[PDB]
Design a protein around this ligand. Sequence first.
Ligand code: HEM
Length: 152
Amino acid sequence: AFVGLSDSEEKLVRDAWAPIHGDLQGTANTVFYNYLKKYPSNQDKFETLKGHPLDEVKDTANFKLIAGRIFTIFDNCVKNVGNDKGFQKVIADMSGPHVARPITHGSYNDLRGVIYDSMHLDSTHGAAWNKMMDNFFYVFYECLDGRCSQFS
Ligand code: HEM
């Protein structure tokens, strides 16, 4: 389900994300690399990266564009903490390309985990962060399941 955050939790989320907000592309590049390295089956899902060694594509514009667009969405979600309709709309608008493709919940959840590891949060910030990410994926998965109209 979608669960609203408390004032303190909203603050904790913004603070948790702050370091990444301040270097969005640089964090994105490292996280997306660690993701494709630890979970290599996913590289094939990106036609622009498919068929090349990870180390051959990691420094390319294609790779950074993909990494950057993922983190821009999460950045825009954090900006919309406290605005449920705005938060849900950000996700709804990015869900379409994913409805269409052979990508498992495992793949999304593995990405979520690499993101979490890279943030090195204490358990207070982590709990607030996970509430937001649980909300993100509730909306995202509702949209993948063809119930996005409520959010669009
Ligand atoms: C859960 C976090 C992710 C976010 C925030 C996200 C965000 C984005 C955005 C913003 C787009 C482009 C939408 C547009 O063109 O208007 C996109 C496209 C796409 N995404 Fe994601 N994505 C996520 C996860 C994934 C995962 C885990 C994979 C695969 C393993 C994936 C595969 C794709 C592919 C294949 C496309 C179409 C573009 C392409 O051909 O490269 N995404 N995503």
